[PDB]
């Protein structure tokens, strides 16, 4: 009782396009996958909808690999774009190890105003 490559690769392609429909319940999603996709048989849609339900209660959780459903693509862009106030790169004293100070002598940039050793 494993789901084959055709019914998985359909069921991922359904959730691609129509996450705006669908629910946690099976008996709803069964009736969706008639209208969404022309399918020859009855048994096919029960196994497609059976995985479409399975992925929904995985999706109520961290984001599933190899699937992208348009609401999260919008949400990732907002979560991506913004960047917090301040550089966050200024201590601003900046601690530095004893040997790495002697490097900053050898470059020719000691008396930097960034503090030393410990």
């Amino acid at each position: 009782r494993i789901r084959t490559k055709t019914t998985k690769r359909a069921a991922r392609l359904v959730i691609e396009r129509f996450y705006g429909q669908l629910s946690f319940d099976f008996q709803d999603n069964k009736r969706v996958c008639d209208a969404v996709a022309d399918i020859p048989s009855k048994r096919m849609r029960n196994k497609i909808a059976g995985y479409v339900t399975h992925l929904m209660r995985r999706l109520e959780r961290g984001p599933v690999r190899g699937i992208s459903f348009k609401l999260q693509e919008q949400e990732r862009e907002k979560r991506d774009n913004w960047m917090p106030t301040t550089s966050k790169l200024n201590v601003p004293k900046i601690l530095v190890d004893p040997e790495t100070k002697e490097m900053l002598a050898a470059i020719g940039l000691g008396e930097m105003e960034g503090v030393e050793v410990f």
């Binding site: 705006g20 429909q21 946690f24 008996q27 009736r31 209660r57």
Partner: protein
């Protein structure tokens, strides 16, 4: 104010889709996914609240919605079977079935005055039947139709207002009189519009997929107010008497006081990697005494303020 657990009672093995209560008190009917719809009768005596009275075996799928006469005599009920069934209340026995509607039928109401049967489902049309059992009007819409409700009273002469909530997003409102001309049409919900009910007075209407219960105007349209539910809600139903409105989330039932403009309460009773029961329908009694809610495992729970 908040309200304590009065009584769980069960006689129903699969889930419950819808639930409705006959006039005054005694006799509520829980349409069931089992395809069998019971009617109960209410003792309200200590340990048992109710005990089951009939079973309506007839449909060949789940029973979607259930709707009642003003008398509590001749109730009607629909299923995904694509038919409806008038059932004599006292002797069961289907009185007459309905034939015409193509796909699974999701929603039924009467009028106030036992005039027009309003079936609806996934052929994208609100059919209006006669009480005799023949098709009068065939209204139209874009997508599937989950739910309907009817404006209270109207004294016969007044148009009897039919709010509708669709699968795509849109919310239609219609008059009747004779031709049935829609008062207004709007993109009421962002994605999926689950469930529709009226305010008792009927100035306002209620609809709400995107975790947002939104009240709208009956005439013409556009929003009064928009609340935000915690998690997405399956049924909505306002109180008859007092100024409440209530909404069946996963996490509980979010009790808005409408004037104070906030959730005063959230009532779920206590019970890894499981869903655990949702509540898929509400039903206020006609007095505004008691709040019934039908659940996903197959139980019903009563609370009284």
């Amino acid at each position: 104010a908040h309200f304590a657990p009065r009584a769980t009672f069960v006689g129903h093995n699969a889930a419950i889709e819808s639930i409705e209560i006959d006039n005054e008190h005694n006799y509520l009917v829980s349409a069931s996914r089992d395809k069998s719809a019971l009617v109960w009768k209410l003792n309200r005596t200590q340990e048992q609240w109710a005990t089951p009275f009939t079973r309506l075996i007839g449909h060949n799928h789940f029973v979607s919605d259930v709707s009642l006469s003003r008398d509590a005599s001749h109730l009607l009920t629909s299923s995904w079977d694509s038919t409806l069934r008038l059932w004599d209340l006292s002797t069961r026995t289907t009185k007459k079935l309905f034939l015409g509607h193509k796909k699974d039928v999701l929603g039924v109401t009467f009028s106030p005055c036992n005039r027009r049967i309003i079936s609806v489902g996934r052929d994208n049309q609100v059919k209006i039947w006669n009480i005799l059992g023949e098709n009068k009007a065939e209204l139209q819409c874009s997508s599937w139709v989950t739910s309907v409700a009817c404006a209270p009273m109207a004294d016969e002469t007044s148009p009897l207002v039919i709010a509708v909530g669709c699968w795509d997003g849109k919310v239609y409102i219609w008059s009747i009189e004779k031709e049935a001309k829609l008062i207004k049409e709007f993109k009421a919900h962002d994605g999926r519009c689950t469930s529709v009910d009226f305010t008792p007075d009927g100035k306002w209407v209620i609809t709400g997929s995107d975790r947002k219960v939104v009240m709208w105007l009956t005439e013409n349209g556009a929003k009064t107010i928009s609340f935000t539910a915690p998690s997405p809600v399956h049924a909505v139903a306002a109180c008859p008497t007092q100024a409440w409105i209530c909404a069946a989330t996963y996490e509980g039932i979010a009790v808005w006081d409408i004037g104070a403009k906030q959730q005063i309460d959230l009532v779920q009773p206590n019970f890894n990697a499981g869903r655990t029961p949702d509540c898929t329908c509400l039903a206020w009694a006609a007095d505004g005494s008691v709040l019934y809610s039908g659940y996903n495992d197959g139980s019903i729970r009563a609370w009284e303020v």
